[PDB]
Amino acid sequence: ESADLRALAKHLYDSYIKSFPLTKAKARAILTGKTSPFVIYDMNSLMMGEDTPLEVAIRIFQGCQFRSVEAVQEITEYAKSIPGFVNLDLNDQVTLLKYGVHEIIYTMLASLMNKDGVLISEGQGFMTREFLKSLAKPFGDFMEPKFEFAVKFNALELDDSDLAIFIAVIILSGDRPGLLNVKPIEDIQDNLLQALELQLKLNHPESSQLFAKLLQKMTDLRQIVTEHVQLLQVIKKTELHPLLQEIYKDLY
Amino acid sequence: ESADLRALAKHLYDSYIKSFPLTKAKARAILTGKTTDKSPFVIYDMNSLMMGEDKIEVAIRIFQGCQFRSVEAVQEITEYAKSIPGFVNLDLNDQVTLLKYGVHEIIYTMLASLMNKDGVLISEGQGFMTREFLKSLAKPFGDFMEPKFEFAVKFNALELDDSDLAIFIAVIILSGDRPGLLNVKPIEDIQDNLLQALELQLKLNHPESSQLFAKLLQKMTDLRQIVTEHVQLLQVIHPLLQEIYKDLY
Ligand SMILES: CN(CCOc1ccc(C[C@@H]2SC(=O)NC2=O)cc1)c1ccccn1
Ligand SMILES: CN(CCOc1ccc(C[C@@H]2SC(=O)NC2=O)cc1)c1ccccn1
């Protein structure tokens, strides 16, 4: 029943707004001429951006690291709002979060991104892509895939109410390793995919196959995480915040 | 025909899953360190014993507690047997003579899935009672569990999984040497077919393991020796079990 699906969509959108403060609409308002944040483009501009003696990439890197730990509490709160979720084997509840969190972190980071760079700290600042492309040797290309994805993903032109269902669809995947009770998982996701599809048909009629195109984005998204951990295997060789270790262990 | 035996194996595996909630793939998950969020309560002595009631003579409180899942295990076993191709079509009392003598042999086989060196999972994998704690009980219950642990340690070295276990369960059911059997020919017909399927299954799942088939059929001796030694030990001291101990041997 379609109205049951629309009700599903509104519940996720409402919950989404409560869990996540820097929504895409806000961020796109900031990024456009419709509100102002300090721009970091080289690093003369970086440390006038502190308002320091004497490596910058590591507290950028660990800066990134702790928005990850802020985002995890939000996502987890969000997930609790997905109908059928808390009612799952708590062992699958953490497998789902374990393999869902970075895919969502990167989906939502594209919202705070355009082709020049990325909104940082609740919209306070804006660091550029070419500046991130110019960081210290083991780093300096850790953002570039996120950016490549951000442009392709933002071309779909999703808004927050699309993104709320899509985020849920990611969490309830029936292909996570460690998934014991699968049938309840695929049962909810199949319902979320119907809601999404309907939500795509109403909100973007001009877009042919937008559903399809979006599901496909899931492959670049997975590829972001997979490449980032094999990047993470170059930093503790050659040359990280607790909560992350546990997520990264036994992760393919 | 090879592919049919495979097909027979799947039918058995799927019914095994359905009829048995506490499986070995999950039971081991608990027992290893792979369930990194929900873990069972340990009962390793007296003070840990009862502080547990809020989480899961005391000779009896464990004793009957066995019997009721033993009497509960009976349903899902008996339930299982009716998915075994050509079982319902058997004789309707060699059907029950078969269930009669094998029920325990099976429960003891599936008890080993929930066992390791230290103790045994209980109540839907919510508790875990140590073997030493069992050998230290009142009465002569004090060694009511020990042969079964002895069995498990040996049986688990065979390293069997559920899809292996599903088939072996059926091989036990359709014996061909219960006493109460008259229409025996059609049962040794089905077991002939189950054994082919087991043997082919074991070739595929365990190449590395030499004569795993024969080693596995041999475990059947110790297996019924357990049920045997068991009610020699139930003379020294529920309704449904009593029917079942009916001069069993
Ligand atoms: C340029 N930007 C935006 C990038 O913001 C993020 C980039 C990557 C992540 C994923 C983290 S980083 C890691 O190793 N693991 C993770 O989960 C999370 C956020 C900055 C820069 C400084 C401070 C905060 N933001
Ligand atoms: C240590 N464990 C696992 C043993 O679980 C069982 C042990 C024996 C049986 C066979 C029963 S006992 C008897 O005399 N006759 C029977 O048919 C059935 C189950 C506990 C401990 C407490 C409660 C339940 N389990």
UniProtKB/Swiss-Prot annotation, chain B:
Q: How is it modified after translation?
A: Phosphorylated in basal conditions and dephosphorylated when treated with the ligand. May be dephosphorylated by PPP5C. Ubiquitinated by E3 ubiquitin-protein ligase complex containing FBXO9; leading to proteasomal degradation. Ubiquitinated at Lys-18 by TRIM55 leading to proteasomal degradation. Ubiquitinated by E3 ubiquitin-protein ligase STUB1/CHIP; leading to proteasomal degradation.
Expressed, tissue-wise, as follows:
Highest expression in adipose tissue. Lower in skeletal muscle, spleen, heart and liver. Also detectable in placenta, lung and ovary.
Give the UniProt entry's GO cellular component terms: chromatin; cytosol; intracellular membrane-bounded organelle; nucleoplasm; nucleus; receptor complex; RNA polymerase II transcription regulator complex
Binding-site residues, rosiglitazone: Q67, F68, R69, S70, H104, H230, Y245
Asked whether the UniProt record includes Phosphoprotein among its keywords, one would answer: yes
Tell me what induces its expression. Answer: (Microbial infection) Expression increases when incubated with M.tuberculosis or its lipoprotein LpqH; induction is TLR2-dependent (at protein level).
The annotated crosslink position for Glycyl lysine isopeptide (Lys-Gly) (interchain with G-Cter in ubiquitin) is K18
Q: Name one GO molecular function term.
A: enzyme binding
Q: Which residues form the NR LBD domain?
A: 4-247
Q: Which UniProt keywords apply?
A: Activator, Biological rhythms, Cytoplasm, Diabetes mellitus, Disease variant, DNA-binding, Glycoprotein, Isopeptide bond, Metal-binding, Nucleus, Obesity, Phosphoprotein, Receptor, Transcription, Transcription regulation, Ubl conjugation, Zinc, Zinc-finger
Name a biological process GO annotation.
negative regulation of cholesterol storage
| Region annotation (Interaction with FAM120B) ranges | 1-46
Motif 9aaTAD, per the record, lies over: 239-247
Task: Spell out the subcellular localization from the entry.
Answer: Nucleus; Cytoplasm
User: Which pathological condition is tied to this protein?
Assistant: Defects in PPARG can lead to type 2 insulin-resistant diabetes and hyptertension. PPARG mutations may be associated with colon cancer. Obesity: A condition characterized by an increase of body weight beyond the limitation of skeletal and physical requirements, as the result of excessive accumulation of body fat.
Describe its function: Nuclear receptor that binds peroxisome proliferators such as hypolipidemic drugs and fatty acids. Once activated by a ligand, the nuclear receptor binds to DNA specific PPAR response elements (PPRE) and modulates the transcription of its target genes, such as acyl-CoA oxidase. It therefore controls the peroxisomal beta-oxidation pathway of fatty acids. Key regulator of adipocyte differentiation and glucose homeostasis. ARF6 acts as a key regulator of the tissue-specific adipocyte P2 (aP2) enhancer.
Q: Subunit composition?
A: Interacts with FOXO1 (acetylated form). Heterodimer with other nuclear receptors, such as RXRA. The heterodimer with the retinoic acid receptor RXRA is called adipocyte-specific transcription factor ARF6. Interacts with NCOA6 coactivator, leading to a strong increase in transcription of target genes. Interacts with coactivator PPARBP, leading to a mild increase in transcription of target genes. Interacts with NOCA7 in a ligand-inducible manner. Interacts with NCOA1 and NCOA2 LXXLL motifs. Interacts with ASXL1, ASXL2, DNTTIP2, FAM120B, MAP2K1/MEK1, NR0B2, PDPK1, PRDM16, PRMT2 and TGFB1I1.
Q: Which family does it belong to?
A: Belongs to the nuclear hormone receptor family. NR1 subfamily.
What does the record's free text say on domains? The 9aaTAD motif is a transactivation domain present in a large number of yeast and animal transcription factors.
User: Which named protein is this?
Assistant: Peroxisome proliferator-activated receptor gamma
Q: Organism, per UniProt?
A: Homo sapiens (Human)
Could you say which residues of the full protein are shown? 235 to 505 of 505
